[PDB]
Structures are given as C-alpha cells and as structure tokens.
C-alpha cells in the first residue's frame, strides 16, 4: 500500500483523508497516515483547531509519486511535498510504521463509498482545473474563487471549472432563444458534451470534484458548479439513457455522504426542487429523490 508521512504535527488540527477525519493535538507524536490503497485519487485536508478559518488540502494520486506533509511555520500551514528519492522514502515509511506513530486507513471493504464518490475524478483533469504544473498534487482551499466568479481576483489561485451560464450566447442559439432556454439539450449535448468534455465521464468527473471541494472545504464556487452541472442535465429534455441512470447513482451517494448538519449550506433548495419535481428528468432520479425525501424533507 502507500503511506503519507508527516514530519511532525506542530499545531492542533483536524486532518481528513478521503471521507475519514481524526484530530491531532499540538505537538502530538504523529507521523502520518498508513495503509491507504494506491490505485486512483485521494484528498488530504486540514482545518486548524485554533482557527477554523481556511480549510485547505491537497488532491493526489499515490501512483504519481511519493508524497509527504511538512508544516511550514512561516506560511502557517501543512504543505504537501514530493520526495523524488524513492529509496529514502521507503527507508522512512518502512520505519515510521515500525514506530507506529501513524494512523491507518480502515477499509471495511463492504464500504465502496470513496470509489462511488470519485469514480469519474481523475488527477490529470484536477490539474487542469487547479493549475500548478510544477507539482503533481493540487491545492484547494475554502476561499478559492472560480474563473466564472472572477468574471463578475488572482487568476493563478483560481478554480478553472467549465463556465456554465444559462443566459449566455454559448447556451443560446440565435433564433432558438425560447427553445434553448426552456430546453437546455443543445447546451448540454452539442456545447458541453460534444464540444468541451468529449464524453459524459469527463462531465461527471468535474461534477464529482466540484461536490467534494464544496463538502471538504466549504468552497462556495464549487457548490455553485455542482448545482449548475446537475441543473443543466435535469433541464434538458434529451439526455442519453446511460447518463441519466448514472446521474441517479452519483447523486445518491453524494446525498448519502453529506453531513446532516450541513444541508442549509450545501444544498440549494431552488435547484433541488426543480430537478426532483419540475424538470424534464424528475422521474429519472428515483433513488436520489428517495434519499432526499427521507433524509432532508425540510428542504423540499
């Protein structure tokens, strides 16, 4: 398996790895996380105990290199870095375990939750949305704005999500104003799926990444992007059958994983009432509707 070691834990912090989180005290003996699956995509995230402002973290893929965490006392945050000397890294991680100052990832392999939430998320697409070419891992935080938000103030520190805007020339063909506004199928199928994303898997990947950035970091522009990408599908009369069925599964696991105490801040009442009850695809989201009704009846 792979390991993410820490040099130390100088400040008290809540650390998340994928959907799991634990606390570390100030100057606790802690040297990282062990026994995590290689294989795909992960996220390690942080929220400082003495200042819950700025949640931040790093998306990474074990397979792309050896990654570790070191606290930087000048910038005041835990930073991810890459070790290019694999022998040194094996030398550490084969010992720090030997110490047992690391926490294990649990996998009760009945749980497939992480894979259901990240099925379509790929590190190389993350790196296109979060542009920092010199690192193999990608930093996101609670405050980062989207390129689209910026169009309404540092383009380097931004989330380059695909711009979705229902009242824009991209979404509306001249001469089809009412048609394209009331049935977004043109914008979904010709512009987004055939023009920009190439296939539905890449579309779902950005939707899943957006959701996870909203949930893990409380990133508002990510939440906007998640809801937009859902509403575009639901507001289209014409949507491949596979994509609809897959959307229901994707959304079901996202609603299932959402903290119950977080529904006022992560769920947009307007969008969900449209999708589940007033949209072309209402009756195609059977499992999502069932968990929403029983889990969050107040919103609806």
């Amino acid at each position: 398996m792979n390991t993410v070691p820490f040099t130390s834990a100088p400040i008290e912090v809540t650390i998340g790895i994928d959907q799991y989180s634990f606390n570390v005290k100030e100057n606790q003996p802690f040297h990282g996380i062990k026994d995590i699956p290689i294989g795909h995509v992960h996220v390690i995230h942080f929220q400082h105990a003495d200042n819950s402002s700025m949640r931040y973290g790093y998306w990474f893929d074990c397979r792309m290199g050896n990654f570790y965490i070191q606290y930087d006392p000048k910038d005041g945050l835990y930073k991810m870095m890459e070790e290019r000397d694999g022998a040194k890294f094996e030398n550490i991680v084969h010992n720090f375990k030997e110490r047992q100052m690391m926490v294990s990832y649990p996998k009760i392999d009945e749980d497939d939750t992480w894979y259901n939430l990240t099925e379509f998320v790929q590190m190389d697409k993350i790196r296109k949305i979060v542009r920092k070419d010199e690192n193999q891992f990608s930093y996101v935080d609670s405050s980062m704005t989207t390129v689209q938000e910026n169009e309404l103030s540092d383009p380097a520190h931004s989330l380059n999500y695909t711009v979705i805007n229902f009242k824009s020339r991209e979404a509306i063909r001249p001469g089809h104003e009412m048609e394209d506004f009331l049935d977004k199928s043109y914008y979904l199928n010709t512009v987004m799926l055939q023009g920009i994303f190439k296939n539905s898997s890449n579309y779902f990947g950005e939707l899943q990444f957006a959701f996870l950035n909203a949930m893990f970091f409380g990133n508002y522009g990510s939440s906007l992007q998640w809801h937009a990408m859902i509403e575009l599908i639901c507001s289209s009369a014409t949507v491949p059958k596979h994509m609809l069925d897959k959307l229901d599964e994707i959304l079901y696991y996202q609603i299932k994983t959402l903290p119950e105490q977080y529904s006022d801040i992560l769920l947009n009442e307007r969008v969900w009432n449209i999708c589940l009850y007033s949209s072309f695809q209402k009756n195609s989201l059977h499992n999502t509707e069932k968990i929403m009704e029983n889990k969050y009846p107040e919103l609806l």
């Binding site: 009242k167 824009s168 020339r169 509306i172 001249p174 104003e177 009412m178 506004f181």
Partner: protein
C-alpha cells in the same frame, strides 16, 4: 439607493430608457361553447414600448395569427414580446438604442435578457413603480389601430401630443400616468371628463384633447377626484 424622488426624477436623465409593458399582448374574450363548455377567442393585442423622456411610443401590433397552432400562449406571449423588443432595438441606429429597458412585469426579465444577449451593455430590469399602462387600450385611437389591423404592424405615436412645448417630461409622464390610472379605474367616467366639452377637440395627429394650460389643471383635478372617489367606493371610506 431609494429616494423615490431621485429614482423618479432620474427616469428623465439623458440616458435613453424604454418602458416595456406586455399586459395587452395576448388578449382574449371568454364565451360559452355549444356543448356547454367555455372557450377563449384571441383578439389583436399590442406591445407598449415607451420612451418616458420624449413620449415616443413604439406600438407593435400583435395580430391574432401569431397564436395560430401555438401552445402555452401566456408563456409564448412573453417570448414574442421579447423577440419584438429585441428586433426594435436592432432596427434603431446605435445612438438611439436604449441604455436601460424597464419591464413592468418581472416575468418579462428572462425572456428579454435572453433575446438581448447581443446587447450586453443594455441593462434589463423591473420596477417597483406601479404603472397603469395596461389601460393603453382605453385610448381610442390606439385601440382603433390595434383592432383594425389585419397583419403584424408597428405604429409610432407621441403619447404626449405637443405637451413638451410647454411642460417637462417628468410633468407630462405624471399627466400621462394620471390619465391612464383614471381610465383604468373608471374608464367611462374618465372618458366623459375628457370629451364633455365638444368645443375642445382632438387634433387629427394627437391622442388627447387640445386643452389650454388652465383646462389641463381642471382636467387633472377631475381625474384625481375620480380616482379618490373610486377608492372610497371600493373600501367603504
């Protein structure tokens, strides 16, 4: 920022602005069928697009043929209104195009914004002002041109006649909205007030009578009293 007084005065600044009212676009009569059901029949309508500073009214006549074989006509009417307003703007020289379009019903915002995407510097917005433009069809010469149309048609009027030779545009707008609110509130009595003196006539190229300044003061008084009388009748005050 909200000084009613500043928003109202600011309507008459030199930025070109158009009001758009769509309440008379889709019009129907309601009559009983032979099977005992009830049926609508559409009648000609119009878009009311007014420049409040100059009085220029762009009256686009909506002929009933545009509804033929269409569904969800109340919804379509909003989009048809937006299509025609957009076409109007595109037909105007650049220096005559509005900087703001003010829709009297919020339901017009999305249709117009979508039809106006080619003009990103034209602000589209609603208003908290209650305006009585729905009573435009109480103006006999407007109603006559709408009802006589056999095809789509655009007709230009100056809804202030020659008043701007003598009063301001905010005063003329105030006079206009008073007259239209009176016609909306008690049409037959408002028309009586206007036509009571046969020696004061409507010029062939005007909509309203050729009142002198003092007669307009008297007329305006009688309209205020008409509106207040109706209020009292309605609320038992």
């Amino acid at each position: 920022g909200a000084m009613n007084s500043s928003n109202y005065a600011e309507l008459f600044n030199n930025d070109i602005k158009l009001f758009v009212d769509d309440t008379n676009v889709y019009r129907v009569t309601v009559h009983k069928t032979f099977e005992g059901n009830v049926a609508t029949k559409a009648i000609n309508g119009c878009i009311f697009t007014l420049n409040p500073k100059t009085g220029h009214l762009f009256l686009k006549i909506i002929h009933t043929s545009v509804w033929a074989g269409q569904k969800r006509l109340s919804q379509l009417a909003k989009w048809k209104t937006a299509e025609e307003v957009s076409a109007l703007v595109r037909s105007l020289p650049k220096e005559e195009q509005p900087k703001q379009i003010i829709v009297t019903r919020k339901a017009m915002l999305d249709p117009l914004e979508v039809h106006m995407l080619d003009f990103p510097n034209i602000a589209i917005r609603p208003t908290e002002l209650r305006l009585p433009f729905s009573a435009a069809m109480s103006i006999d010469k407007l109603s006559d041109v709408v009802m006589k149309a056999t095809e789509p048609q655009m007709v230009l009027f100056n809804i202030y006649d020659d008043w701007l030779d003598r009063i301001s545009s905010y005063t003329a707008f105030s006079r206009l909205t008073l007259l239209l609110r009176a016609l909306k509130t008690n049409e037959e009595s408002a028309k009586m007030i206007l036509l009571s003196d046969p020696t004061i006539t409507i010029k062939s190229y005007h909509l309203w009578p050729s009142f002198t300044d003092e007669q307009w003061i008297t007329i305006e008084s009688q309209m205020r009293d008409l509106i207040l009388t109706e209020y009292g009748r309605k609320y038992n005050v």
